[PDB]
């Protein structure tokens, strides 16, 4: 989707402590939003483990069952490297795989 947080006011820069201000949140209709406002000094002490959208996609890619940027040794290796199983009535079928992880490169 698209969630955006911005100020409602368009002037009165640097508000006063305790002052009322308007927080404006633009986002897809029907979604539930959770908020947290923290002093940046806490992150100057420790900014580790900060969750973000990029690290979310990082965990998704780390759970991928595909192990090759395409191609393969043959038609069976194409599907087996992509993460697919193929089987036909004729007899042609994908290579057997019994491991969740991807084979490790030699490096």
């Amino acid at each position: 989707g698209s969630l955006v947080v911005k100020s409602g006011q368009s002037e009165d820069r640097q508000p006063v402590p305790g002052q009322q201000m308007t927080l404006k949140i633009e986002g897809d209709h029907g979604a539930r939003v959770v908020l947290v406002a923290v002093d940046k000094g806490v992150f100057v002490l420790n900014k580790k483990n900060k969750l973000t959208q990029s690290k979310i996609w990082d965990v998704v890619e780390k759970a991928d069952i595909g192990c090759t940027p395409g191609s393969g040794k043959d038609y069976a290796g194409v599907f087996s490297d992509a993460g697919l199983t193929f089987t036909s009535s004729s007899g042609q079928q994908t290579a057997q795989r019994a491991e969740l992880q991807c084979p490790q490169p030699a490096a």
């Binding site: 402590p17 305790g18 002052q19 009322q20």
Partner: protein, 84 residues
């Protein structure tokens, strides 16, 4: 009689404006009693500024205190309406 001169009438108009807000000052300071501590802090700070400005007759301080006291008054008005 002769009519008042250039600035005497103007200075009186400003003072009358400040006197008006000061009459309801004790009410507004009281009204913040059930409001958040931000208002209670803000109005008592803005209150003395107007009080000193009136007895000093300083145009600079009387002008600012007027608009300073007017702003916190408007903040209280919105606060009471949204508090219901």
């Amino acid at each position: 009689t002769s009519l008042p001169t250039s600035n005497e009438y103007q200075n009186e108009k400003l003072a009358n404006e400040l006197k008006s807000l000061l009459d309801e000052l004790n009410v507004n300071e009281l009204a913040t009693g059930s409001l958040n501590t931000y208002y209670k802090r803000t109005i008592k700070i803005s209150g003395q500024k107007a009080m000193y400005a009136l007895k000093s007759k300083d145009f600079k301080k009387m002008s600012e205190a007027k608009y300073q006291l007017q702003k916190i008054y408007n903040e209280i008005d919105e606060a009471l309406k949204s508090k219901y």
